[PDB]
Structures are given as C-alpha cells and as structure tokens.
Design a protein around this nucleic acid. Structure first.
Ligand SMILES: *O[C@H]1[C@@H](O)[C@H](n2cnc3c(=O)[nH]c(N)nc32)O[C@@H]1COP(=O)(O)OP(=O)(O)OP(=O)(O)O
Ligand SMILES: *O[C@H]1[C@@H](O)[C@H](n2cnc3c(=O)[nH]c(N)nc32)O[C@@H]1COP(=O)(O)OP(=O)(O)OP(=O)(O)O
Ligand SMILES: [Mg+2]
Ligand SMILES: [Mg+2]
Ligand SMILES: [Mg+2]
Ligand SMILES: [Mg+2]
Ligand SMILES: [Zn+2]
Ligand SMILES: [Zn+2]
Ligand SMILES: [Zn+2]
Lengths: 646, 638, 647
RNA sequence: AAUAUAAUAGUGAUAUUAUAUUC
RNA sequence: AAUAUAAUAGUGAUAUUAUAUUC
C-alpha cells in the first residue's frame, strides 16, 4: 500500500525498538501504523529466530476487525495470525495456540486470566506487545494488570527477555491535574505503567495530517429549563401520596425529580429491608408493600427527570409502560397504586398534549437540526444522550415531529438513516459513517472522549454542538479543553528531555509503585450459619451451609429445599460467560413475589442456580441481626468450594 | 511572489465586478489591492486613463498604504498622492484629485469635499477601494460616500460610476438570530457597497491555512470576590445621598451610574427666585452627585481589579479638588480612609479574577519564556490598574508590561483597536479581560495569532460574557453559510435584488427628512455647575456650521484660560488653551481656546451649559444640533 | 442473517448427514449455504463430543475470503477458525493446528502432502469435508487425491469413521458424453469420486432463485477473416528466407497456424541432437539453428496476433522481440536476422498505418461496443481473449481508437511467466467462479472456446437482469462448440433430474460399485552409468549426472565448484517461495553469452543452491555417445542420489 | 515441480503449444 | 465637532456611560 508520511513518522520510534506510546488524532489510520510496526518487527529477525506479536483489543468488534485485517495482510508473508476471545477461550490449549502462531489478537482479560492460572508462564514468549487505546492502562483495568506482570518480571531478581511495548492512543489524558506540572506527572506515570520511554506524535508532517483529519468547529448552546411545567406538580402530588403510604407503616427517619432524591429513596428502600417483626408473615406483607412504594417513587422520579430532558409524553409513556409491567405479573398495593395513577392519568395526558407546554431544549435542538439540514440536506448527524430512556424518547420525538420529517433516526445502545441516536461509545471503536454534525445533548465526559469524538467529524466543515440547560456542563467541557492544552504542552515538554533521563525517571516511578503495590491482608472468616431471605417478601431462601463457591467468584446452592423457593423464566439475553452457560432467569416463587434472585446456568455436567448476594437479606440466627451486602467479596463467612464429588 | 489565493481573491475585481473581498486578517490584502489597481490602470486604451481612490479609515493605515502604493506605482507612469486631515486645508483638492492617478484618502475628506462642491461627482474616479468595508453602514463616512454614489445611480444623472471594491475579514451578520436574517443583512451590506460578488478563498483554502492559523480559544469562568470594602463604601454612598436628600437600584452597578447622571440633570434644572442660593444649592448637589459617581466607579474598579487600584482612584480624585462641602466630603472620606487601607492590603481579600489571570500568565510563560502577550481591558482605569498590578506582583516579575491606548516589552496592555489596524509584533498569547465585542472584532483579533500554536483566553466572572462570545461564534457560522449560499446565486438575479434593496433603502432614507423654525427669543446660557451667568444667545456666532464662538469683552470676563493638556490641530483651527468657569473655583469645563486664521477665539460646548430664558424655565442640550435658535454666521468683521 | 428459501432447500440434504453434491447457479450465495451447513453440523453434537470441519478452497483469494467470513461468523459461536495455505504450511505443527481448531480452511495440496508424509494419520479427524468447486474432483487433481485416501479407507478394512462429504459446484459437467445416457454415467462416476448419495438442486423454490440470478442472453457473432494479407505476404518471405538460411546449414505445412508451430518446435528439438566430431563448430551451428527456429516461431506468433488483432500489434510484438534480442548481446546470427528484418521494416509499417487494412473482427467488436454503450453509457464490459499478447493488443487497440474513447480499459491476467473508472476489463481466463467482481452487463468472448462448466460459470458475471453475452469469431467452429456445449448443459440437467428420482439406497449401491471398480483399476530398472548434461542451445557441457542430487523427490540440484563456472545469474523477476525453497535469482548459460535458461537459484534451509530443469538440457551417454531429450525429471531414468546435507 | 482446462497432431495411451492455478 | 463599536435602561425610535477613531 501507500502509507502517508506522518504514519511512517509515528511508526519510526517503534521500528527502532523503543517502547513507544503513539499519540495521534482519531482516524489518522493507526491500523496501518500497527501493520507497519508489526511487519518491520517480524521481518527483522534472522533465519534461526522468529518473533511473536500480541495485539490487545479491548472490544470484540475491534478484536474481529483487527484479526481480519492482520490475517489478510500477513498471510502472504508467511505469518500465522490468530485470536482468542471470551467465546473461544474455554477448553482450548491457549499455550499451544500462542506458541503455534506468530501474531495473536487478544482481549486483555484472556492474557490476565491465563497468566494468573499459570498456562502462560511468562510474557517472555512475546517479542512485541501492542495496546490499542493504551490510555486504559491504569488502576485495575486488565491492561494495567498485564503491565503489573511485566513490571514485576522486569524489576524482579530473575528477569528473562521482555517484549517491546507499543501503546496506541488519541489522548493519554491528564487525569484530575489542575496545572501543567501535575499533567506532566500524570503522563510520566502513564508512561511508567507501559514502560514507555518515547511519546511519538506528528510534528514534521503536521500539514499532511491536517489535510486528512480536520478539527470540527465546536459551538455551545446554553438554553433554559422549562418554566411552564404543570406536569411536575401533579407527579409531585403523587409522590407525596405514595410517600405518605410509606409513612403509614413506618415512623419518620430533598427536592423531587433530582439525583439526590434518588439516593435518598434507594437508601430508604434499603432501610425498609432491615426492619423486622416478631410475627414475620406480616413481614412478608409489610416489607413487600414498602418495597413497592419505594420502587414506584423511584419510577416517578425517573419520569420527572425524563420530562426535564424530554417531552412530557415520554415521561407518561415511561410510567404507562411501567404500570403495564406491574400488570401481567395482581399484587397487593399494586392495584391500589395503579388506580391512584389512573386517577390523574386524564389530567396528565391533558397536560402532555398541550403545545404551549413544550420543552425549550427540544425547541433549540429542532432549530439546530432544521438550520443545518436546510443548509446541507445530505447531513449525517450523530446525537449523544445520557440514558437509554432518552434514546427511545428522542427517537419517538424525531419520528413524531412534522418539522423533523426529513430525519430518519436510528438507535445505537449497549449490550437508510440520516441521524443516529446513541448513549456513548467506549474509546474510538469501529469507524462508522462520517458525521458532519455531532450533537451532545446534556453530555458530560472527560478530555479523552472529547478528543476521540472528533474522529466522527474528520471531514472539513464538520460541526459539534453542546446543548444544555446547565452551565456546569459547558464549563466542564471548557476545563476539558484546557486539560487538552495541558496534555499537549506536557507531552511537547517530555519530548525535549533526554531519552536516558526519562528512562530512569520511568524506572523509579515503576520501582516506587511496585514497592507500594507489594506493600498492600487476609480477613478472618466467620463460620456461623446464616440465612438468606428475599429482599422483597422476606421469605426463607437459603442457608449459608447450602451455599458453595465456584471458581472463587460465583455462588450456587445445593439442597432441594431451595428448589421449592424459586421459579424460572427463559433468559432475555442468554450468553455463555467463562465455563458457564446462561439458560434462565430465577425469580422468587412465593405468592407472585417475582423478585430477581439470580440466574440458572449450565456448568459442565451440572445444571445449577447462581445467586447474587445483592438480591438477598442476611439473617444471623444467633443474634437475629439483619445486614445487607453489595458484593459477595464484602460478605465474609466461610465459603465452601464447589466439590463435584458430592 | 503572489500567493495563489490572493490572485483568486483579486480575480472577480479584475473582471470589472464590484466585489467585497472577504479573507482572514493578515493574509496580505495589501498585495491584492496592488494587483487590482495595477490591472485596472493598465487595462485602459491609449486615449483614456483611470483614476483610483483608496479609502483608509485610520491615519497609520493611510500612511502605510500611501507609502506602499507610492513605492510600487512610481516605477510605472502613475502618480500617487494622498490627502489626510493635516494636509486637507487650504489646498486645491480638486486639482490634486485631477492631477493624480492614485489617491489615498481618509473618507471624511471626500465627504466634506462632496458637500463643499469642490468635487462635483464620483464619476471622476474609475475605481474605489474601501478598506475595512464592513464599516459601510449607518452614518459612517463610507456609507455617506456610498449614499452619494447610489443617489447618482438611482437618479437620472446617468454619469459613469466607479467600480467598487470592498475589503474585510468579516462582513458581519448584524443582529441576525438565524441564517435567513444573516443572509438579509449580508445582502443589504452588498447593496450598500453596490457589490454583486463576494470573493472568498475556496480553491486555494489549503494554501491559505498554512499562512493564517486559527488560534485556540479558551474560556475562563471565575467567581466574584466574597467584600467588607464594598460594605464600607456603601455607607459613604448612603450618607452622601443623605446629604443630597437634605437639600432635596443599588451600588456598584452601571444602572446606578445612569441613576446618578439623571439625578444630576434634575439638580441642574432646579430653580429659585433668588440667584446666589441656587448657585451653591446646585453647586452642592453637583459635587454630591459627582463624588457619588467617583465612588461608584471606584467600586467597579475594585470589582475588576485590586482594592488598592480603587483607593488610588479615589485618592487621586480627592487630590484633584476646595471648599467647604468638599472639606466635609473629604473629611468623611478620611474617617473610613484606613479601615479601607487595612482591608485593602489583606492578601486574603485578593481578587480571584486577578489570581486566575496570574495563573494563566505563570503557566504560559513557564512553558514558553519567549511568549509575547496582549491583554485587552475595558477602561483606561483598568489599564493603569493592571499595569501597577503586574509591576507590583512578585510572581509576575518576568513580565515587562507596556501601555497601548487611544524586545523591551513582553506583555502589552490595551483597551481596544479599531478594525485590523497597522501590524504589530505578534502575540502567541491574547487575553481578553472581561471583554465583550462583536463577531467582526473576534475574527480580527485572530490576526495577532497568525502563527501556529497561538492561544486566546476569555477571562470573566460575569458568565453572560461567555454566552455573548459563543453566540458570536455561531454568528460567524451563520455568516460563512450565508456567504456560501450567496456565492451559488446567479449574478444577474442578485444584481436585480441588490437594485431593489438600494431603491428601498433610498426611499426610507429620503422618508426620514423636519428643520424646526429657529427661536429668535434671546436666550441665556448658565454654567451647569454654579449656575453662573455666562452668555447671551445673541453673542454667539457660528463658524463653519459646526463650531460656536462668543463675542464681547463681557464673556472674556467669565472664563479662565489654561494650556491644553493635549494640543491638536483640527480643520482650520488650532487647539491651544482650555476654558473654565472663573467663579469661586468652580472651574467647570466650558470649552477650548483656539486660533482661527488671524483671530484668537473661544469655542464653547452647549453640553456644559444650561439654557434658561427670560420670558418664562431651563432646558439642557447635549449637542448644538438639538438646540434650535437663530444662529448668526461668523463675520470676520466684528 | 436472513437466508433465502432455496439456500435452506439446498442445505437441507447436507444437514441430514447425507453426502451431497450441491449444484446451483453461480452467484446464488453458496457461502451462506456453507455457513448454514457448518453451523448445523457443529451444533448438532452432544456435550461430550465435538465436530471438526475442513473447507477446501482451490485458490488463495477464495481461501482468504472464506477464512475471513468463517472466522467473523463462527467466533461468536465458540468455534475457532483457522487456515493453512502454501505460505504458512512450512515449519508448522499441522497436526496440532488441525487438532486445536474446529473449522479449518485449506488448499487441497496441503492435505495431500500432509497425508502423504503421515503428519495427519487419517481423515477420521474430520467429521465434515466441504469441496469448493467440487467438479474438479477427477483425474489427478488434489481433490481426487484426497478422495483417493478417503475411498481407500472406506473400501479397506480399517473401519475408521469417515467425514460427511459436501461438494459445491455450479456445474458437474457431462464430460465427453455425446448423449444423455453417457452423461448419466459421467455424473454417476463423479458422485462415486465424492462418495455422494445425493445431488441437491433448487426445485421447489426455483421461482425465488430466478429473481436473484438471471440468465444473460447469448448472441453469436460470426464474421469474416480479413480478405487480403500484405503483412503475411511479406513476412512469409522472412520465414522463407530464415528457413532458407536454415536451408544452408541443415543437410536436410502452412504459415500462421498451430501446425507450423508444432513443426518448428519439433524441428528445434531435432536440431539439438545433431552431432559433429568438432564440438565448437557443432555449438556454432546449433546456436544458429536454435536462433533461426526461434525467430521463425516469433514470426509465426506475429502472424497469429495480426489474424486476431491489428497488424500494428503484431509489428510491435516483433519490435519488442528484437528489442529484447538487442538487449541480450551482439550475436552474428542475431545481428544478421535483425538486419534482414530491418530491411523490410519501412514497407511493413507502411502496411499497418493504413486504415484500409483493419480486420473485420475488430470492426464488428467496435460496432458491438459502440451500440451497447450508446444505449447504456454506464455499461460495464468484460472481454475474454485466449492469450496475454491479445490482452495487450486489445488494450492498446481500445485507447488507440478514437471511436472507443468512452472506454476505460483494464487488465486481468495471471501471475507467472462500475463506481471505479474502468468501464471494460480485458482478461484471459479465470479459474472456476473465483471472487465476485463488479457485475458486467456486457460479456464479450473474443475467439473463446470453453467447456460446459466454464460456460455456466461465466453467467455469474451477468447475474443482473438484462445482461448480454456475445461470442465473436471468424473460425465458425467456435459457434458449433458453444452450441454443443449448450446441448451438453441440457443433457446435464436432465440426467441430474433423472438421478434425483432414483431410490437413494440403490444409488448408494451403484456408487459403491463404481468406487470399488475404480480402486481395482487404481491399485494396478534405473540406469547407473554416468551421463552428460549439455546446453540445448550452445551444446556446452553443464553438468555430470554424478553431480546431480535430488531434493524431496522433486527438485534437482548440482554439487561441486565446477558447475559454478558454467552459469551466470540475475535477480528473479518474480521472486516466489515454493515449498521449503525461496527463489532468489535466475541462472543462465555462461558460455559466449548463450544465456539459455537453465533453471533458478534458490535458498533451501541453510544452503544457497542452484536448481535446474532437465527440459533445458540434452543428455549424452558417455559410453554410447547417443544424445537424448527428456520431458521432466520423472521420465529421465537413472539412479537419483538423494540430497545429503552431510555430503 | 505438480495440477486442471482449451486448441492442434494421432485410432489411442500420449505429445506440443496456449491459458490458469497450486505447492 | 462628527462617527463607529460595547454594556445598561426602553417594546421601539432613542438615551446614558465606556472605548476607539476621524475632520
Ligand atoms: O524443475 C523446476 C522446479 O524444480 C523449480 N520450481 C520453480 N518454480 C516452482 C514451483 O512453483 N513449485 C515447485 N515445486 N518447483 C518449482 O524450478 C525448476 C524449473 O525452473 P524454471 O525456470 O521453470 O522456474 P522459473 O521461476 O524461471 O519459471 P516459473 O516458475 O515462473 O514458471
Ligand atoms: O464643540 C466642540 C468643538 O467645537 C471643539 N472641538 C474640540 N475638538 C474637536 C475636534 O476634534 N474636531 C472638531 N471639528 N471640533 C472640535 O471643541 C468643542 C468641545 O470642547 P471640548 O472641551 O469637549 O474638547 P477638548 O479639547 O477640551 O477635550 P477633547 O475633545 O480633547 O476630549
Ligand atoms: Mg495511532
Ligand atoms: Mg526469521
Ligand atoms: Mg478485569
Ligand atoms: Mg463600523
Ligand atoms: Zn421473594
Ligand atoms: Zn461655574
Ligand atoms: Zn548455452
């Protein structure tokens, strides 16, 4: 092929064998850079020797793409390309697969798990490592675990040969740094994490690069929240009523429609779970009632937020679908609350259909769309929003707007079209259709994602609007821009340093961090038998004596006493994780409780339930004390390993 | 030598089309003008010759352009001349224009000469070039010239008209809230210059982008200081207001400034059967409102700068004054005095804005010690304030500040610069301190940042300023898109629309033209401060329809002459002295003393006088044009 | 994914575990059929068992395509996909690579070689085999070798489990059959070769299939040969004068035909064995004769080229030839011949610059292109010709023609010795279906003679409704060949539809019979005295058979520093790595700038060694003196000493 | 080096050339 | 003396102030 000069320039520090973090704008063709570095690396070895390259892709789509491209590129040169992902990782000779292939594409967790398991004895088997989106190397992220192994081998007493390390990123990030010095420290710490002595950027060839990747012009639209809202009043009345019904069965202990009230109502929901009675099949009644109350309050709050960021109709549809899910499941207070909702449904719908009441944010958004599509009818737009509810909401709003009829919206979420509505995309991901219009709707993110989003605006004349009713959002974007300045300046300063000095600084950052990392014990396990009841209906589910732990992670149940406590519905999203294969979802079997207990999976020969401690209440039969645990790791008792021999 | 995009910009003009040339500041528009003029002059046959006039709105640009054109076209058979305010008097401008091929002018010369009748028609020029043509609008001299032009075009004069070439970095969208309105405004501007073509760099854009780089803009939002100082001055405002209230909407805002000015007006129109008693009731209220005003300004300065700057402002004010109620006011000021001073030097209380500014300067100069910085502030008071602040800050010791108002210097503090102006030594750092301006000035300030890597910060605690700047950016988008649309139109249809707009505007312009009958009742001018008898309206003679003088030995009594702080020669006059009231150290500013021809005469402004009259009452007039009486022409015979 | 009904219909017999030959039109999307069959095959097994699929792609582009598609598709299902091609086949644990992967894409030669070595012990390791373009399974083709192994295991007493066999083709072919019954025999024999009991075709869903793949209309253009050859009139004089020069030294049929080519080749081979007591004189006259016959051959080629194309193209062919000759060096004979050619050059270029002489075939072709592009300017054309010389010829003819200016020609050939802007693609031929290229709504066959299979396969370029295919020829036989090929297609479809009606059991019995018969048929002294290897051109001593060593029972090298003085070398124009060898340079005869091609120079393991072909040499027995010529090293019979690194 | 297809010569095993592919 | 820009007040013409320029 025909590489651009800045690509050769970026690859040059790596082709000289130096561990290198390559920092270049999104969409500059880093793929061919990787191909160049890899080709040169593999061809440099004499006849009696051969190298082994490992490419780390953090996402399955990137995994498949890179595997495909590398395979098509290097097959002719006599280099075997393969890959190992979560799907193909089980019951396979991973060591042999690594050994028998020259280029191997991995998702990092495979290498982490296989290093920890011992199947891959050392990283010395690889002569080269490439980290895609290498800014992810930090904290507990798998990249950083791999690099922990690397640095432990390097700084350790007996150290074999180590692979060259090449990172790839659009932005290294400054962290929380408030000034260029702190930024410099963050960047140096990142370089220390990847053992990189060189940061490669485009300097000599800048004009060529700027003819390829163009920087989109960014505008900030500051609008105001709706002052016309009568919907919030009614829904607030409902919230007060339900609060009173919760205040009926309890005694005592800030604003409606905010995050703070969400925290409050969640914590309260937790509080109602620890309350106990001496006659406890009234507990099944009371705590279930309180659970339903707090849940409905939560949903109402969510509706208020949705109405704040979108149409009132979207909030009413949210609630309607919610109460639709309440039915087709005949509860208790549920019919009561449903009726109470239908009381105000007519008034609410009367308010939602009033054109005078419409959201000014959507008005301004519609304005932007209208103008830009009037000037350029061929415009491809991408619209980022915070939550999936907003995705569906703006989908329906665009489809239901006569003004926007020129739009043909589409959906992009987690787990033909003019405009694509999405939540967020981790890092760069696979290149999609170029968008000359990017709209950030109440969006807040870091500097890295800011720089990465520009990659959708690569063409000249691309535009990016940030639309919000909050000033904090805007100034967050601005401090992110300043952060970008600090980043570039700190990098430019580092590049002026002597390579040896930087190597040593990196060395002591590594050594210090390793001392700290080795400095960081074993908690005393309690053998007292507990009871696991339901967080909703407080019904007896398990005893901790019946609970076994599989692979130091998952928890299952043995006794047949549990088989009468649960029902099962076919899993909405069946998938196989590790050695487990998801089959069904598990719910409480008592009196339509239908609380989510966990999943039902196929493990080897056995088919067993797996439960989450997040879904249950802990009962100490000795002290009668009830407590709540978020993660199984925070629950300290005696966990008996799963034994197939029983 | 020529860069392609300059040829591209000059092409529509070279084809004889009236053209608005729109390109980024500092792309070398001068050579574009040179190309256009050269081709225009050399295109004529043997029996004919061209005459080009170049309008520069500012004297530095005037001199620069005159010099460059002179050096360039002397080689060829074309004579280059120029006429500015200094050389415009007692010279046959008609012959000067007639005897030269290229004439560089400040627009007021051509306006005045068109009215005077010395230049009968614009038909004498075959080419006109407006520098910073975005200024052609409203009552600006450019627009006056173009009013003459359009008056000839739409009329039955049927004389030949000059090709019109405008030059600007931004045409502006005006007040437009959307792309359609922007399109309307731009079409009206094209109509004002009678231009059928907007020339911008398109084919060669990538060549233009390696010359002029767009500096990165950051926005710094801080918070206001949290203020015992303000709390102290508040009572001075209150009790001074009580002193005013004894003889007869909050503090620190320009609203209160409006308030105090329009209080002072009413204090000037108060009247009484006696004479003396009002003289110093009005003197008292005058000084009360004045000192109140100065206190207000002091609070504002304390908000935008150090407390020491405000204290120095007040101290200088009280130093410039004396008596008795000045002694009272001063004494009351000396009571708080210190607690002012003691609060001021408390490091605790420092302005966060200045802290953030100092941070910015610190970082940028730490990374690049060779940095050149330019700092824009709203008022001269802030210029001096930040001057002393920079020179008085240990952290800023690397800074060697300088002053630019209306190497040896690392940072240059300025107020504002009209349009692009003459080229300066360019700053890789531009800081806008509480700056609010339009889209045009925004684009023009980029000219200081042409080098790659230049940065521009906008520092404010107001947060409405930020919104203003960003909607200005959106305005730029609207501008470029509207232009991009106009460029796609068919030229004929566009010329038709332009014609319609021209006729429309001329109809409205002719619709607005009054002239009330002059009141012959003899009037009386009093000093606005001390209400002293100053003049009779029958002593006032008018010189050249503009300047008003006074006769009689009686008026020579009433005013004192002091040498002018800034002597300057305007028109046929010469500023020498300054005129003040002679009463009881009132010394209100009445006007100036000038030398006109062989005469030494006083010139007064109606703005400093109040018009009382005998039969009936008083009124105030800001300008002489608003004051209607019988105005007797100045006769050299006394 | 949303599979079409006929794809499920085609995949259904295979999903039932039946060995199946899948016969469907080219471009119906057979890849999805393969994906369905493989997915079902892999997901059918219980927990304690797992399947292993092997896919056979005959060409590297298809190899990479299929590997990519299968990898992208089956990764999410938990099945590892890999491949082994010629490039990656060396110095790798093939057995482990096969064992550790669920789906393996392979070029058949890899499997044949690995079975022959014994690295892969049995075909029992695969539960499913898929042959792409399975009509190639016959004779000595690698597919058929694999199936020889398969059937040897089936008919033997090994009693090991065998994989399900699924073939894929657009046409099974009738072979040489003159009638339907014989066609039935051929098809049955093919089914016996693939051990297939079922032939799957689209029947119920045909109405759906015909809305995807459309049959292009075929037109037959029969034109006239050019009426008068001035060019051949004068060049027959150069052939006559050259064979008269040959007629001086000899002491011992139509021009412009293949008969003359055969004759001049046999003559050239006859001149190499002539011997004299004086060996240097012998070398002189043998070089002379070789050169004469060579120039004769080139002239003949020119005649043919100008028969099928412009006379300018033939003239330029000869000019290119003599350019190369001039580049070779100054030989007395070559200088002479070139001189006599240059004498007639003026007259010649005089005769092809005339517009009057343009051949009727190119005129008719020009008419076709003109009309079709007049009706549809967006037309994409593909032009098939027999030889690469004609590819260059028509390539230059198109852009050298003012009327054809709307055409943007392109070149498609082999490697060896709509939205884009190429409107027309000139090509020689493409093996089987190959990777799908841009759809051509115009297909021009210029003097093309194929078989029924290639005819059916070329329709895949015409899938769109309204596609057209012209057959333009002056021979008048070609028409008949294509027609009888159409009849062959009818015979094929009819015989297939007849076979589908049989009871499957009976068919299995007939198949077993044929297989056993074929196995019965299939199961049915070297000279030790030294020989000399002489140059076929200059008769110079190159090697002795005692110095020749045989590597891997295939390639032949030479030992000793003596041979290093007999040849020169220049870097290989097309460097290529075959097997364990890496091509470096070409070796030529070093004596008096003979420059005859002896072979190649390669890197084998640690060694840098020459490899020679017996085709370029003459074998002289030291004892008898008798000189002989040999086809390939296989037919040369002497005791061949294996290459020993320790020697 | 092997393989396939096509034309030509031969009754045919084959042979020559052309074309393509693979190792 | 004229003019332009910006902020504030007014629904607007305008008005005040700030800044800059020109004759
Ligand atoms: O005898 C042959 C053979 O030993 C060796 N050879 C050349 N190419 C190959 C190949 O692709 N595969 C195998 N197994 N063996 C090969 O070369 C000898 C003959 O040399 P050539 O002059 O014919 O080879 P060359 O490269 O010059 O021509 P070509 O291979 O392009 O056709
Ligand atoms: O009414 C004005 C006018 O008659 C005269 N005047 C002063 N400067 C100019 C000038 O630049 N151009 C013209 N045409 N006329 C001028 O003075 C009268 C007002 O006197 P001021 O006190 O306001 O002017 P002064 O010089 O004292 O102050 P400043 O103008 O520099 O700020
Ligand atoms: Mg990169
Ligand atoms: Mg090697
Ligand atoms: Mg992890
Ligand atoms: Mg202006
Ligand atoms: Zn329950
Ligand atoms: Zn006075
Ligand atoms: Zn030789």
């Amino acid at each position: 092929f025909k590489p651009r000069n800045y690509q050769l320039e970026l690859a040059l520090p790596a082709m000289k064998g130096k561990n290198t973090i390559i920092c270049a704008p999104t969409g500059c063709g880093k793929t061919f850079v990787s191909l160049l570095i890899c080709e040169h690396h593999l061809k440099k070895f004499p006849q009696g020797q051969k190298g082994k390259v490992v490419f780390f892709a953090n996402q399955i789509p990137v995994y498949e793409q890179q595997k495909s491209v590398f395979s098509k590129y290097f097959e002719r040169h006599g280099y075997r390309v393969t890959g190992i992902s979560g799907a193909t990782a089980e019951n396979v000779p991973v060591e042999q697969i690594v050994e028998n292939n020259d280029i191997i594409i991995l998702t990092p967790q495979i290498l982490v798990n296989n290093l920890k398991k011992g199947t891959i004895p050392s990283l010395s088997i690889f002569t080269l490592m490439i980290f895609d989106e290498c800014h992810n190397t930090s904290k507990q992220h798998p990249y950083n675990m791999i690099m922990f192994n690397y640095l432990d081998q390097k700084l350790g007493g007996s150290s074999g040969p180590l692979p060259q390390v090449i990172g790839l990123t659009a932005s290294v990030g400054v962290g929380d740094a408030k000034n260029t010095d702190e930024a410099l420290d963050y960047i140096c710490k990142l370089c220390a994490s990847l053992d990189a002595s060189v940061i490669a950027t485009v300097k000599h060839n800048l004009e060529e690069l700027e003819q390829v990747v163009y920087k989109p012009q960014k505008f900030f639209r500051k609008v105001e929240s709706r002052i016309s809202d009568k919907f919030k009043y009614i829904i607030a009345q409902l919230m007060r009523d339900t609060e009173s019904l919760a205040k009926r069965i309890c005694k005592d202990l800030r604003e409606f429609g905010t995050q703070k009230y969400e925290q409050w109502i969640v914590t309260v929901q937790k509080a109602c779970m620890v309350f106990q009675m001496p006659d406890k099949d009234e507990e099944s009644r009371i705590c279930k009632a309180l659970f339903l109350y707090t849940s409905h309050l939560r949903k109402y709050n969510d509706a208020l937020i949705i109405s704040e960021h979108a149409r009132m109709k979207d909030a009413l549809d949210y609630l309607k679908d919610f109460f639709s899910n309440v039915r087709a499941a005949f509860d208790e207070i549920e019919q009561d609350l449903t009726q109470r909702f239908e009381e105000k449904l007519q008034e609410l719908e009367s308010v939602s259909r009033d054109p005078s009441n419409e959201n000014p944010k959507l008005e301004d958004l519609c304005f932007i769309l209208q103008e830009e599509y009037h000037l350029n009818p061929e415009t491809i737009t991408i619209l980022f929003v915070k939550t999936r509810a907003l995705v569906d909401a703006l989908k329906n709003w665009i489809e239901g707007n006569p003004k926007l009829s020129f739009l043909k919206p589409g959906i992009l979420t987690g787990r033909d079209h003019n405009i694509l509505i999405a939540t967020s995309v981790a890092d760069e991901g696979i290149d999609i259709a170029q968008c000359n219009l990017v709209i950030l709707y109440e969006y807040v993110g870091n500097v890295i994602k800011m720089i990465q989003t520009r990659g959708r605006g690569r063409a000249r004349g691309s535009k990016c609007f940030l639309l919000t009713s909050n000033a904090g959002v805007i100034e967050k974007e601005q401090i992110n821009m300043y952060k970008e300045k600090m980043m570039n300046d700190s990098i430019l300063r580092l590049q002026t340093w002597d390579e040896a000095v930087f190597r040593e600084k990196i060395l002591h950052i590594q050594t210090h961090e390793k001392f700290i990392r080795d400095s960081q014990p074993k908690p005393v396990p309690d053998k007292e038998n507990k009871k696991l009841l339901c967080r909703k209906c407080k019904a007896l589910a398990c005893y901790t004596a019946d609970v076994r732990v599989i692979e130091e992670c998952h928890y299952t149940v043995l006794g047949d006493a549990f088989k009468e406590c649960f029902v099962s519905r076919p899993h909405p999203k069946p998938k196989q994780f590790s050695s487990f294969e998801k089959r069904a979802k598990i719910f409480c079997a008592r009196q339509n409780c239908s609380h989510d207990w966990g999943i039902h999976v196929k493990y080897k020969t056995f088919e067993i339930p797996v439960i989450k401690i997040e879904s249950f209440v802990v009962e100490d039969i000795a002290t009668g004390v009830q407590t709540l645990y978020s993660k199984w790791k925070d629950f300290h008792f005696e966990k008996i390993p799963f034994d197939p021999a029983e």
